[PDB]
Assembly symmetry: C2
Homo-oligomer: 137 residues x 2
Amino acid sequence: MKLENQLSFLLYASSREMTKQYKPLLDKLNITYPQYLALLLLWEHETLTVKKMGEQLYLDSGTLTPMLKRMEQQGLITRKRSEEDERSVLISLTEDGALLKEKAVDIPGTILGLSKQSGEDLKQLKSALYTLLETLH
Amino acid sequence: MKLENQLSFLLYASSREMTKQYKPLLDKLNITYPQYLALLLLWEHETLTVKKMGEQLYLDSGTLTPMLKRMEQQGLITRKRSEEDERSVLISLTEDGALLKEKAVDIPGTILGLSKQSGEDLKQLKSALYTLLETLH
């Protein structure tokens, strides 16, 4: 029952350690970590309701609103009450937010190399984590 | 650059999903998740300063104090200003906190079986996560 033999703790700790590995690369784009993840969601789907936005990202309305608020100011996104259902809000990407992808494309390779983990070890780690994540859903 | 191809996000998400898998088993002991981790640290080291306590657990003074406060009330721990250095605080375990280990010993096997992940797949997942965690340190 050692703390470090618990898979739940191992996932979370590694989570913290990996994240901090971004500050250096993201400080240049001004972006923070959560904003970076939201951006990866947006360069992929262009438009998303706020429900799904926090849904797949695990972010509470408390740390979701200030984030978008800053992105809007930066001109990375744009809100819009849904006309199909006023009860929801859509978040679209601006051509400024889309052109920002040009200089992020290399962040992944960099950080993956900064983790000192290489080869298929990372490919299997990821593969297993996705399966696990899919299972618990 | 898909969000789900990012190892940092995969670690965190899986982290959330795994954790929620505790509520059922911990609600019986009254313990919450963070308190459970602290308990695993304590059934292992008996006494720890507050610095190391949050150090290896990644918990901020904000979510660390209320936790101990509740454990003390439950009679699971006991504080004590360090006599060797008044500038630190030691957290010891009570015989009530130590006898609580009797009914937690099975929580791990249960949850590990609730993750539907089995065999050496879990042993290697863990092994790799610890190595990664050690690397980023």
